[PDB]
Amino acid sequence: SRVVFDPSNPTTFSVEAIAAYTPVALIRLLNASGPLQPGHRVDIADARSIYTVGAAASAARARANHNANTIRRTAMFAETDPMTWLRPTVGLKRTFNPRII
Amino acid sequence: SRVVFDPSNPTTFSVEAIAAYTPVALIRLLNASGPLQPGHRVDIADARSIYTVGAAASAARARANHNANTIRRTAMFAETDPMTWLRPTVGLKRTFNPRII
Amino acid sequence: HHDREWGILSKIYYYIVIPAFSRGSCCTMGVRYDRLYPALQAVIVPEIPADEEAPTTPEDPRHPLHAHQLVPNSLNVYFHNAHLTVDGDALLTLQE
Numbered sequence: 001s002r003v004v005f006d007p008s009n010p011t012t013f014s015v016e017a018i019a020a021y022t023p024v025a026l027i028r029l030l031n032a033s034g035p036l037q038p039g040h041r042v043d044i045a046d047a048r049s050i051y052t053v054g055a056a057a058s059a060a061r062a063r064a065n066h067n068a069n070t071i072r073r074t075a076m077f078a079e080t081d082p083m084t085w086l087r088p089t090v091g092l093k094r095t096f097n098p099r100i101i
Numbered sequence: 102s103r104v105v106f107d108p109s110n111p112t113t114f115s116v117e118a119i120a121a122y123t124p125v126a127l128i129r130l131l132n133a134s135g136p137l138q139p140g141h142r143v144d145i146a147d148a149r150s151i152y153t154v155g156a157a158a159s160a161a162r163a164r165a166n167h168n169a170n171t172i173r174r175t176a177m178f179a180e181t182d183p184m185t186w187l188r189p190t191v192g193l194k195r196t197f198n199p200r201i202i
Numbered sequence: 203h204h205d206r207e208w209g210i211l212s213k214i215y216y217y218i219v220i221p222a223f224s225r226g227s228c229c230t231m232g233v234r235y236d237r238l239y240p241a242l243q244a245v246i247v248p249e250i251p252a253d254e255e256a257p258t259t260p261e262d263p264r265h266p267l268h269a270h271q272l273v274p275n276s277l278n279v280y281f282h283n284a285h286l287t288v289d290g291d292a293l294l295t296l297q298e
Contacts, residue, residue: 082133087241167249198256
């Protein structure tokens with residue numbers, strides 16, 4: 001379901017499963033305003049937070065799906081050197097190709 | 102002889118036997134140390150020195166094993182003998198990709 | 203061997219424009235050899251078969267340390283950060 005009239009049920013699993021193209025098209029066709037009266041949409045901050053967390057979840061799912069052909073991400077710094085008295089550990093600066101080939 | 106609690110057993114015995122990459126990864130993944138009271142945690146300089154000696158020995162052994170294309174070596178200084186009335190072969194040192202040997 | 207001419211030349215080279223250009227940046231530097239020795243002491247490299255050509259740039263997919271055996275570690279990330287023509291024969295000379 002991709003109807004803003006009753007978005008109580010299609011909030012997380014519906015967004016994670018289907019792509020963001022349909023909600024993007026719905027938002028584009030519905031300008032920059034939406035009816036906050038129908039459904040469980042109190043004010044606009046809650047709706048904005050729901051939309052942002054749904055977009056973040058969809059992006060994370062897409063990244064996880066596409067990670068099969070890519071390499072796992074790494075942090076800018078290591079912060080994994082408990083042996084400070086023995087020797088320090090330098091950071092990581094990824095400059096190689098993110099793709100396999 | 103691979104207990105991370107005491108930094109004296111995995112110093113050279115577990116490093117010079119095989120490639121040091123696996124012990125290094127195990128040490129990195131097994132934190133640094135635990136209870137330092139029941140053990141020989143004093144005088145860490147000797148432990149560091151013996152660990153570095155073992156690492157150097159393992160690296161030298163690996164280099165000798167992998168140096169199948171470079172076994173003949175000579176000196177660089179000339180006129181080391183009274184019988185230097187002729188000019189020997191000049192050639193070149195190990196400053197090229199291994200193609201012939 | 204001959205004289206203090208080497209020291210005289212060194213002091214002349216270090217006392218012409220170097221203090222003027224480093225008035226605000228000259229300071230003593232410490233030596234943490236006891237702490238930095240184990241970081242570079244452990245150096246390993248897979249065997250490279252002969253009758254081949256050594257890679258020029260460290261970006262080809264055929265590099266043994268880039269295809270599937272990179273791993274973070276400490277020496278590996280250090281080499282990734284400062285791998286300016288340090289592999290191959292340079293790595294062999296460093297190991298020697």
